[PDB]
């Protein structure tokens, strides 16, 4: 068998993507039923980015100032309101291809698929993780604002991320679909910096279980460790603390492989103190921390969607 970074199958979302143009500024919107959701900075010009007073600028806009295009079909805007950092444009036709959907706010360490779009058209899909410092490591050019991240469960799409901005260190920041920013960021071209990032230990343990399941077992030692001693070592290498809840979440993988969690912890501790000595795991020379336990179970058990 095999192990690859896998994105959810798309299509349900692509039928929802539109172009929104306000004067010279253009970005992407999400068309669900008779409402289009888009970033509110679309109503700003290039000078406005320094210190935009959004209330003043939005009071001066009428319905006709918004040009919304779904491929060839122009949609008439008949109302608009602002919720936090997102605009909501009421349009006069409901989207016939609207899927079953939910809005969710994810926790750091969780993963999702991103559909990168430009000028209302999709360019590609890829998976990313929410880093402990509330950034993501994506791939986004000018024009990509309004692209969304999502998860699928059977038939229900959970939208969790709308893209807004790029930071100095080449990381990316955005909001949930209710318009609240992830992390301490603001939609302004000001000095902002990502904080110290940490490594998601539970994801590394999931990846080592994936490796064991795929037959890469050279790193298994014969020792065990205590939780407190492990976290003493982990803290020195800028790893997050392992909690008892995390230990319980790894239970199914442990049962599947017959390897207790604390043995994997001892093996990770040895990898951390001694390196990989030129060896690779799953084709990688670095430890990978962007697979949740659910991702591993899904890929190794082959869960499908209607």
């Amino acid at each position: 068998s095999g192990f690859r970074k896998m994105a959810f199958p798309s299509g349900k979302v692509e039928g929802c993507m539109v172009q929104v143009t306000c004067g010279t500024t253009t970005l992407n919107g999400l068309w669900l039923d008779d409402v289009v959701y888009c970033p509110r900075h679309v109503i700003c010009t290039s000078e406005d980015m320094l210190n935009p007073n959004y209330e003043d600028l939005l009071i001066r806009k009428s319905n006709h100032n918004f040009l919304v295009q779904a491929g060839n079909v122009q949609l008439r805007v008949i109302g608009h309101s602002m919720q936090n950092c997102v605009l909501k444009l009421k349009v006069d036709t409901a989207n016939p291809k609207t899927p079953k959907y939910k809005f969710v706010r994810i926790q750091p360490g969780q993963t999702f698929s991103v559909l990168a779009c430009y000028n209302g058209s999709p360019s590609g899909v890829y998976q990313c993780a929410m880093r402990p410092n509330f950034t993501i490591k994506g791939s986004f050019l000018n024009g990509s604002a309004g692209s969304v991240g999502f998860n699928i469960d059977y038939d229900c799409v959970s939208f969790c991320y709308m893209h807004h901005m790029e930071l100095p260190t080449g990381v990316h920041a955005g909001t949930d679909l209710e318009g609240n920013f992830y992390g301490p960021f603001v939609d302004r071209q000001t000095a902002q910096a990502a904080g110290t990032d940490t490594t998601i230990t539970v994801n590394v343990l999931a990846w080592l279980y994936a490796a064991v399941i795929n037959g890469d077992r050279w790193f298994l030692n014969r020792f065990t460790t205590t939780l407190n001693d492990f976290n003493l070592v982990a803290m020195k290498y800028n790893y997050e603390p392992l909690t008892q809840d995390h230990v319980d979440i790894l239970g199914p993988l442990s049962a599947q492989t017959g390897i207790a969690v604390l043995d994997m912890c001892a093996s990770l501790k040895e990898l951390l103190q001694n390196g990989m000595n030129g060896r690779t795991i799953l084709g990688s020379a670095l430890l990978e921390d962007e697979f949740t336990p659910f991702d591993v179970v899904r890929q190794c058990s082959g869960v499908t969607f209607q």
């Binding site: 143009t21 004067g23 010279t24 500024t25 253009t26 970005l27 970033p39 900075h41 679309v42 980015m49 430009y118 000028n119 986004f140 050019l141 000018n142 024009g143 990509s144 604002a145 893209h163 807004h164 901005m165 790029e166 930071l167 100095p168 939609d187 302004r188 071209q189 000001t190 000095a191 902002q192």
Partner: peptide
């Protein structure tokens, strides 16, 4: 280093 808001152009 200032942030770049990644909106496009018409």
């Amino acid at each position: 280093a200032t942030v770049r808001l990644q909106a496009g152009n018409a």
